[PDB]
Amino acid sequence: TMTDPIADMLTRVRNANMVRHEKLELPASNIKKEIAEILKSEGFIKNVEYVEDDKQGVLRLFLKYGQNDERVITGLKRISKPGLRVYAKASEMPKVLNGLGIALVSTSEGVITDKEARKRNVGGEIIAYVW
Amino acid sequence: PTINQLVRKPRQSKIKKSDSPALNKGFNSKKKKFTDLNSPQKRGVCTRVGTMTPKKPNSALRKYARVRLSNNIEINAYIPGIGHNLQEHSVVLVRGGRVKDLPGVRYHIVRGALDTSGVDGRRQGRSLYGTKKPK
RNA sequence: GCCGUCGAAGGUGGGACAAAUGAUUGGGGUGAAGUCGUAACAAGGUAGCCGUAUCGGAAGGUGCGGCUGGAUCACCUCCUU
RNA sequence: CAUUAGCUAGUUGGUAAGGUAACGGCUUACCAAGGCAACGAUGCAUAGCCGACCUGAGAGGGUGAUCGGCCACACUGGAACUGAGACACGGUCCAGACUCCUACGGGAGGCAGCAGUAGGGAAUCUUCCGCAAUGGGCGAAAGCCUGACGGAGCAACGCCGCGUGAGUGAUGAAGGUCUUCGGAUCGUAAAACUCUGUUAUUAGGGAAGAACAUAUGUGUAAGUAACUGUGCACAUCUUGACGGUACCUAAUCAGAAAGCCACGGCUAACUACGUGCCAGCAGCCGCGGUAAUACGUAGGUGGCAAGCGUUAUCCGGAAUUAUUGGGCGUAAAGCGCGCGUAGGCGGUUUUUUAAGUCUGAUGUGAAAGCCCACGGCUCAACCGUGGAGGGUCAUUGGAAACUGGAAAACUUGAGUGCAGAAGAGGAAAGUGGAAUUCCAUGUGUAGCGGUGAAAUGCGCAGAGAUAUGGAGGAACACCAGUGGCGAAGGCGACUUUCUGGUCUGUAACUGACGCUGAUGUGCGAAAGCGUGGGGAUCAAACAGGAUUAGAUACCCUGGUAGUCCACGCCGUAAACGAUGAGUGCUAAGUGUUAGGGGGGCCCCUUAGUGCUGCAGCUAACGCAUUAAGCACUCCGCCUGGGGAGUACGACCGCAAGGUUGAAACUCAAAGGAAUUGACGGGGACCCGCACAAGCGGUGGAGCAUGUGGUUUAAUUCGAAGCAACGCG
RNA sequence: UAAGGAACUCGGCAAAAUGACCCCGUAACUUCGGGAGAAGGGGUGCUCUUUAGGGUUAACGCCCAGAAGAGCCGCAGUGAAUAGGCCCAAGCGACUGUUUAUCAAAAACACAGGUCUCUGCUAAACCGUAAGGUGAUGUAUAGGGGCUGACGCCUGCCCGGUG
User: Fold this and answer.
1) How far off is chain A from B2, nearest CA to CA, in Å?
2) Distances (CA, A) of A95 to A3, A39, A84
3) Does residue A82 share a domain with residue A22?
4) A110: distance to nearest CA of chain B, Å?
5) Could you tell me the residue range of the domain that residue A57 belongs to?
6) Which Gene Ontology BP annotations are present (chain A)?
7) Are residues A41 and A3 in the same domain?
8) CA-based nearest residue to A122, from A58, A113, B88, A131
9) Are B92 and B114 in contact, with CB atoms under 8 Å apart?
10) Which residues lie closer than 8 Å to B76 by C-beta, 6 or more apart?
11) A57 within 8 A of A28, measured Cβ to Cβ
């Protein structure tokens, strides 16, 4: 059965990006909502649309591609998995691709990126690597 | 495996079986027991000196010696060099290192040592094969 | 001074375990181009293999079930253009 | 270490008493039956633990010499006394084993203190000086003791530093070694001149470590009737094992001070000679069989250098146990398949909590170590200071996204309800038709049957054939299909009775009730076993008859168990999609099975089952919405090939046998996919004096010729299938 | 009966030794029942204190048993009589059983279990000349005869000869 809804979300983005689909939809969640808006503000995807249905509303993601159909997102990697969780301190926050990619960290200040997480000097759960 | 499978069954590495086992064992004559020593060399008595035919690809008469070491262990040892003065009841010093051709010879008799002369005409490589500096 | 509870060592007994050794006896490995067959690799002289049982100097064969990790052939059935 | 599964009986708890510095089964009585254990009780083997050391980029892996902290021990084993503290290394008592004395009754001893001896071993040192410093015991102190300690003796055992000479000088002497005989190389290397004294020799100076304690004086403080005396403050006197040792200064001399290993590739360094698969070398690949850069030597070269190599062991390289950081279709690896327990993981929202998580503050993580900085030895090693670092650490605040806990809410997951669908799903009992065999008759006559050919074999006592009838067993033609059902194994004649599962539609209900699943518990093709039946057909084995050189085989003739039923047992298969289960995502095209909804046809759609085929994956073959793609959860399994699925042990079984499952030893391969050829008794299509039709020749005899063989003084040398033999 | 303890002997024949009760322990091997009382250890007298127990009961009292202490005495305490020696390993027979009264008790006979064969009922087989019976008032899961002999694993080859 479904065990990691977030890993399903990143794989949905990975699979759609590989075949260059312009848009995808997935069942929404509060944490899955934030990850989408982090990727929007960081410039990985074009827009996030959240549609209210009766049960677990729909998250519509519009992927961004470049001039020569250059996939803006290169890869996605779930770090903290249900079988083994990963937590990091503010001092040992990882630098994805030497800062050329973001790490999604869920801290006490909400779901944020790894760059300004060192600014707040807080740590949390390393959700995923996006580069 | 999965992390849970690894937690229940931690990874088991392979054990390393060492060559020259007879150099890793000592003896206790008081307790009549074998010990573990890891000796560089062992000293023994030659109970048989002869010549052994080599493996099939090669062909040369190779001198060897059946040596009963300080332990109660009887091993076969090579005799490097050209000439040797060893007969029965000769005390020798035996080091590690096997002979590829000779099946059943896993040791080397150290030349130029206790009751073992060096090579008579050796002039380059006298550290091995015994023999002192000519003139 | 005596005796009495504990009490080391010692003695007796039946078991447990571990090494060494033993007439003799089993299969394995190595070697000297020693003798009989030719079982498999080509449909390898009779497709092979697996499981099983029974026979045979020996590889094995045959009996029942299964697989293609089988040829050629007769065609299925789809695909296909 | 599970091939160590059940351990204990003061055991476990309580109640009293005792005694212990003190709680306590610590001990004893009496009650109860308790206590620990797959989160590894117990047992076996091994081991002092740590700071720390080695290795590694790190994660980790190995180790526990010297220095420091803790523990335990003092010939082996018990016990207490004295004592604050011992059940006591140079204390006591007893027992034991040793060694020594004895007038035989009895006595003495304990180097795992420092040296040292014997022994074992590959291997580890002087039977030294001094309390001069630091520390300790005792004393008011002077002092005494201190094998602690401070120093000396030996050992390249290690690290560090300096040497063994430099400047000019012909890369020409003479000599080696090669040689293409011209030369080249050792080589600026050498003489040759100048030059230095690090070192060395001798011959003069010569530290620090020394602060003292005491004693002496001088003041001060407290307490004093006062003094002595004490604490404190000052300055005087004193002393050194090392040791005339560091160290410095004068002369003198290039003189007294380099060896080891390699040179085939990995891997820096090539020639000649000797030998000739020998002698020998080798870590692997391997070398050596008259022209070895691989063996031995000589020159040269190169790597290091007071060291250089070999051996022994650890980490690395090894991603070769893969947490970082591997895999299971064919290379090793998915359990034969279900049902399921612990455990692991788990759909969306809200509130709360704060165990994890994150962020601070305290305490500690000794010192010595690692790293950084700084200072002192002439530098360095080394030493000393200051930081840093080091924890699944403890206490205490703060945050609340996630994981965890509590309380509520929701349907999509999962189930239930309702309306439908198909099915060789299973069990039991019945009912049929075709066929085989046998039996009884009628007809019937000389064969039947079988092979490549045979024959055994059945017949003439009437076989085979044909017709009728009867007995019995087993299996269900046509339907029948990349068809259906089942978790798998498997399930095909029809009927009835029980009974399991699946699919479609709806959205009526519950609101996460789910997935996977060690141990466990069941099912599980054939063959096999037991009991009792049954026995038509086919038949392992067995008999023959053939083929072959042999044929305990393929061929033929028969033929027993078995094949069938009912109970049990067995629990294995190429039990295969050689592909674990669950969930979601990711181009299409076209079928078939079972439904649904719309406009016989078209479109859409659900679940199966197929064939092509994208992205993507793979070593390739290939897979590809029924993944071997992309992701998450859980389980099983693998770590080169033999030995070997073999011991041995356990467990299961009536047995066969099944499950679990090594090692000694041995090799450098084993293996997968694909490629090029060659082989196929391995087939289709063609050709060729290959076959057929043939006309039309040798091998028998005598002679000639060349050979082989024999012989000889020599019978010269070569040719030995086709492609030597009237050949040179 | 000193000391020795199978040296006697064809052979430990005979004799000697263990023996009761209570407690603790008990192996291999197994057909899982057993082996087993296995082996191998310890105690038992008397008096007193103490004080559980249940049996008849109205209670006294009467019975039959326990436990813990403190003594006492002998050489010895089931103080006499009566009451298993044991263990290791081979054949043979599975076993309990039965046999030569009056020299053989066994390895011989039985046996439960196997197998073959005969027999359809006025059965076969048997006693009788016959009638009458036995078998049996039985009916092929019954009856007679041969052979073998619990159980476990098994039982090869030969049909010429003889039946």
Assistant:
1) 8
2) 27, 16, 21
3) no
4) 28
5) 1-73
6) translation
7) yes
8) A113
9) yes
10) B64, B65, B66, B67, B102, B104, B105, B106, B107
11) yes
